Amino acid sequence: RKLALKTIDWVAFGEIIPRNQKAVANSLKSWNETLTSRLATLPEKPPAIDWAYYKANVAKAGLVDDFEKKFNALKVPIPEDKYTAQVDAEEKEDVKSCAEFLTQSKTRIQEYEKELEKMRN
């Protein structure tokens, strides 16, 4: 429903925890699994009442019918974000990860390989 795999993730996750969150992720993994199995189970929506039987055969229908109208008119919101600029601090952390490590390290490796030439000998 709500989640998905992105990359390689529930396994590939847990092992690997950037130090600036590292400790958190260990705890967070197990929390997530709890949410995962829970959500998958729940019902998604109930039935929606057979009015015909109830209206006819609950003959206090002044009450029933008024409550009916209020129920049928009854509108519903959604839950709330709170925690999803983490989603976006992601693209930031993704810079840090590649370019910030990618680049500096690629220049480092540049030297290690050029030095490989002579030390064949």
Partner: protein
């Protein structure tokens, strides 16, 4: 039978007279009403605790800004 439909008539008559009236229940007095009240309480617990004649309100949830 038909001499036994003579009794069946009798009952049908009393049912309407009551229904279009009431005296307590016509034939029942407070005693009916009192018994109901003893059953009526226990059923509230089986059925919830309120809102029995009035639509349930709801509330909505929050988070932590991190």
């Amino acid at each position: 039978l038909d001499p036994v439909q003579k009794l069946f008539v009798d009952k049908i008559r009393e049912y309407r007279t009551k229904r279009q009236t009431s005296g307590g229940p016509v034939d029942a007095g407070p005693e009916y009403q009192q018994d109901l009240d003893r059953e009526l309480f226990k059923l509230k617990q089986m059925y919830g605790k309120a809102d029995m004649n009035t639509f349930p309100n709801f509330t909505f949830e929050d988070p932590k800004f991190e």
